[PDB]
Amino acid sequence: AYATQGFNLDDRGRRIVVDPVTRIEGHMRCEVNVDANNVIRNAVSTGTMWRGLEVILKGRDPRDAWAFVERICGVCTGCHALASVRAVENALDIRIPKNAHLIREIMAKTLQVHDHAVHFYHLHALDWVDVMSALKADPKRTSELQQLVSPAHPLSSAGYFRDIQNRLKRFVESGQLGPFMNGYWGSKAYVLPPEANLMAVTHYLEALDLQKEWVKIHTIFGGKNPHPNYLVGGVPCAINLDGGAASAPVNMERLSFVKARIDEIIEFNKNVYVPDVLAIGTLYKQAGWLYGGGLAATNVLDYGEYPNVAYNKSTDQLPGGAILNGNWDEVFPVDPRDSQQVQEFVSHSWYKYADESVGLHPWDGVTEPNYVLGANTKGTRTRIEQIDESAKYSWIKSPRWRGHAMEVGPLSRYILAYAHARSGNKYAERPKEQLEYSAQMINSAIPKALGLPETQYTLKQLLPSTIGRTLARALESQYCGEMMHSDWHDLVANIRAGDTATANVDKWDPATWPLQAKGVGTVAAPRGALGHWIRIKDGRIENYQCVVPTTWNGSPRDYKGQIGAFEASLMNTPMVNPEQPVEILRTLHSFDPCLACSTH
Amino acid sequence: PRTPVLWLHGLECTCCSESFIRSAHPLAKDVVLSMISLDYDDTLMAAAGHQAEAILEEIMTKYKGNYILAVEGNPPLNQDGMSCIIGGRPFIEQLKYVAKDAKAIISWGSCASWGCVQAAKPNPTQATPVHKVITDKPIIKVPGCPPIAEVMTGVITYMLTFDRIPELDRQGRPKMFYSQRIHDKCYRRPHFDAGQFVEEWDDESARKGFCLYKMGCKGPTTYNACSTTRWNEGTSFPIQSGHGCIGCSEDGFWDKGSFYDRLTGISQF
Ligand code: SF4
Ligand code: F3S
Ligand SMILES: [Cl-]
Ligand SMILES: [Mg+2]
Ligand SMILES: [O]
Secondary structure (H helix, E strand, O other), rough: OEEEOOOEEOOOEEEEEOOOOOEOOOEEEEEEEEOOEEEEEEEEEOOEEOOHHHHHHHOOOOOHHHHHHHHHOOOOOOOOHHHHHHHHHHHHHOOOHHHHHHHHHHHHHHHHHHHHHHHHHHHHHHHOOOOHHHOOHHHHHHHHHHHOOOOOOOOOOHHHHHHHHHHHHHHHHOOOHHOOOOOOOOOOOOOOOOHHHHHHHHHHHHHHHHHHHHHHHHHHOOOOOOOOOEEOOOOOEEOOHHHHOOOEEOOOOOOOHHHHHHHHHHHHHHHHHHHHHHHHHHHHHOOOOOOOHHHHOEEEEEEOEEEOOOOHHEEEOOOEEEEEEOOOOOOOOOOOOHHHHHHHOOOOOEEOOOOOOOOOOHHHOOOOOOOOOOOOOEEEEEEEEEOOOOOOOOOEEEEEEOOOEEEOHHHHHHHHHHHHHOOOHHHHHHHHHHHHHHHHHHHHHHHHHHOOOOOOHHHHHHOOHHHHHHHHHHHHHHHHHHHHHHHHHHHHHHHHOOOOOOOOOOOOOOOHOOOOOEEEEEEEOOOOOEEEEEEEEEEEEEEEEEEOOHHHHHHOOOOOOOOOHHHHHHHOOOOOOOOOOHHHHHHHHHHOEEHHHHHO | OOOOEEEOEEEEHHHHHHOOOOOOOOHHHHHHHEEEEEEOOOOOOOOOOHHHHHHHHHHHHHOOOOOOEEEEEEEEOOOOOOOOOOOOOOOHHHHHHHHHHEEEEEEEEHHHHOHHHHHHHHHOOEEEEHHOOOOOOOEEEOOOOOOOOOHHHHHHHHHHHOOOOOOOOOOOOHHHHOOOOOOOOOOOOHHHHHOOEEOOOOOOOHOOOOEHHHHHHOOOOOOOOOOOOOOOOOOEOOOOOOOOOOOOOOOOHHHOOOOOOOOOOOHOO
């Protein structure tokens, strides 16, 4: 047992294993120890996959890299491609044209919305929503709840909710429960009334049908979703309003189609997703379930993203930096080029360095596998019963910022935005407004509407919690839909003014390149701070290192024994039943773990 | 009773699962609620850990030789199989266990079919396609990174309707979706036939939708339904949106040179 970061870790209690962790992307094992009262007093994050993309890239053409690294992940599809083209463009001093910038931003913001909304409904909701309780709901009371939660959502009739309920009934009564089989239904960890459960299940189904429309924005600009195409120097989707305009990738009709999809997104975020998260968050807040803050209460980081003037970072609409020790009055600048800032340790990871007492900046990064289990393992090399976290216990590296363990993600971006806004940064006004609105809804308006006591939680109290982490994701989805709505107008205006350029090809040919170069590309990816760091030599990739948001959040302990965001978030959480991982899943899922991303 | 599907995930990026849920005809919602019983799937399932693991046993017993095993991703043979760990054991052990009593095995995507990105040189994990590990069961390969949504649901729909695997080509792919090269019906083919090519990104030729052969398009050597069925309810495909096919449904496409290097011997196409 030892203390770190204000957490008293203790592995003497009852050991619980969750393997596989489901409703995530990829492969994770989680172990915890619980005390005599079922409170988690130790947590262990194990990434259970590795593919070695960084190794595979060596010797290849930098222009091809985006397609390889895009296949790090099909859920956060394209964010790696974006990071890669940015890194190569940074290395080779390539400035992309305005339309390429705007198209990439629209693609990025489309991914944010799709990834966030699908995460919440299809991966996260079942940690909050009891689908069997939905079968008991009264359709009229569900209609009434819907009208209170979101007055503008037109799918609100008792008959509509009755029809959905009856389909669920028929499904369950078949005896083939499918994705609901062996669930934790009826646990006291579930607190929603039947009507709220039926509303949420209805929206699960609505979101499942609608999510396929949103990605058609990727399809127009990038050819396909998942895995749209990108390009070093711009975008491939050449523009022609009049000229073979029907055969051109982008004409006015295609742009009108994109706007129609954006407008639908704005309605979904405002009428379905945000109100559901506010309502569910309010009810779990009322139940007192404010666990899961972890490192969000102290240390958060993002690179900063979405400059309303291209290549001018002071205009980032999600402004980044680092906060330490819960001091929201001081945001430190984060520089991905600084060898003393972002570093990765492998002390507790299945890799090898020459010297594992130091962390490597990713321009100097090394990925040599070393799968070996500790002396205190229960089981064998190929049949693990209890992993030994005192030794190497994960395929995830341990990123740190100036040695500090940080949480990344939408919550981090929203805390950073709030801090920036309070210091006078006008570019963060919208997230500040959303947070203040959300706090008023959760504390006063929703309780009033539901006949519950009004509360007086501050943003300092509400945000560093599993509820807060889930809220920030929904707010971010809304904000990204709003931003790309503006980006669309800017794109169309620029094209109509006579700038139709989509690619800078001045340095497409490697005969124009410097014989060596290094570059970095960062992205505010859906789960947090993404970076790709490249070294180029003689036209080829010399080194390519990725540090991915779930690498930060899911990281194992560092050389100093400091815990990462997942492990910290599970600490000090009571479980209703230690053999039912409801609370573990609820909190882990609030980070939206992408394990393929984390390990690459 | 709806046919159980046990959908396993090896080393993968999850693109095939995401593509499946884009299907418009049929809706994935209708597939899950009314066509199959999706009893195990790490992506969507309520149960975790021991409760998730227990489902496999139950379905295998109750529906022995009458469930479909769908596999996304692939098993690694290096690191003693523990570069992909499930329930503390190598994925390859789960794969072999569930495969034994399946009535059919679907290899979703290029990972399961051939290896995909993790199997590109130097293949640090010795990631290996399903058919090299499971050699005594009927397999259908549905390659692509990912495959088209309606191709995935089209395969399922055929299998459920007929209780048969559709006719396969020599490589194990369904002829109903993989009989044509992209280049056969590509709408830019008349430009190819007339020697009208893009030579630099965003040149005048690109703005007129000229053929992408000289920009590395691998459509002439790649079998898929992208030129006809197209992507995301027929909204576009890679070539329509201006990037050459990178060959993503073909075996070993990551190690056939740069995506931007043209095929040699243009006269053969
Ligand atoms: S080379 Fe590619 S773009 Fe040209 S006609 Fe063939 S498939 Fe279409
Ligand atoms: S890259 Fe793949 S998606 Fe189709 S157009 Fe080529 S087979
Ligand atoms: Cl392949
Ligand atoms: Mg890395
Ligand atoms: O993928």
